[PDB]
Design a protein around this ligand. Sequence first.
Ligand SMILES: Cc1cc(=O)oc2c(CN(C)C)c(O)ccc12
Length: 282
Amino acid sequence: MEMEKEFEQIDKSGSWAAIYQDIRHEASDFPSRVAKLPKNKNRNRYRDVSPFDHSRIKLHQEDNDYINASLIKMEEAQRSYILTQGPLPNTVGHFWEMVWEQKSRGVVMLNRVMEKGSLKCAQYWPQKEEKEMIFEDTNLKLTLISEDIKSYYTVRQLELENLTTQETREILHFHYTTWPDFGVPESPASFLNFLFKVRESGSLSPEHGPVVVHCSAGIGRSGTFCLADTCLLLMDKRKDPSSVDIKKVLLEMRKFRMGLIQTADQLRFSYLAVIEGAKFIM
Ligand SMILES: Cc1cc(=O)oc2c(CN(C)C)c(O)ccc12
């Protein structure tokens, strides 16, 4: 079926939970043996969210190459994304090592450091220009260059230096700051505006390594971001845009990381975002 009318048909019939459970039943199951080794317990935020072995990002290190991060490679859309958990106190250096090694331009953050009165990820970037951060375990230096605070999101320019080689690179930090503590946003308008700002920066383009996107577990809000982006790109590429099937795209993405889209409300919000976004594109 088309999307907008499939949408109203699920609303009128109140069957979002049944649709979402079907997705959960059909989703791929691949091994994640490296994630579960005992030496990696303090590298995982949640025991039930792990990267598959076949698609995990490897750190360029011989001691321990493990990080909780996955490469989502979308062949028809010609887009790639790295989806990862919010960094932990003992993985902030690994996080920036990955950004460096994978040649990423942009980092997309969809959570606040504290939500619901608890810490959802480490404070992993500097907040003042004159107070830079040094990650001694991976030999990197990170400096805040500029910050632009808007009503729904903040964009930061950061400098990442590899202290071994003295090479430097400019990284863009795109921080969506207004996702509610509970539920999903009422309108997709600010989320779509944010997606378009990431696109306009070059961070999603083939001349750079894959964008790094995270929330707390790296599957819920993060899944909504890449699902909406890929569906809108396919609607631009194909002769028949009504052929784009958001459930099929989501199942393809779940071949590369488990659990993408965590609730039926997130599924409905993803439909809403693609529907409204397709009208603005034209
Ligand atoms: C992919 C890759 C390229 C590279 O330059 O080096 C690697 C190393 C070691 N060097 C010193 C970083 C690894 O241990 C693991 C992977 C790589």
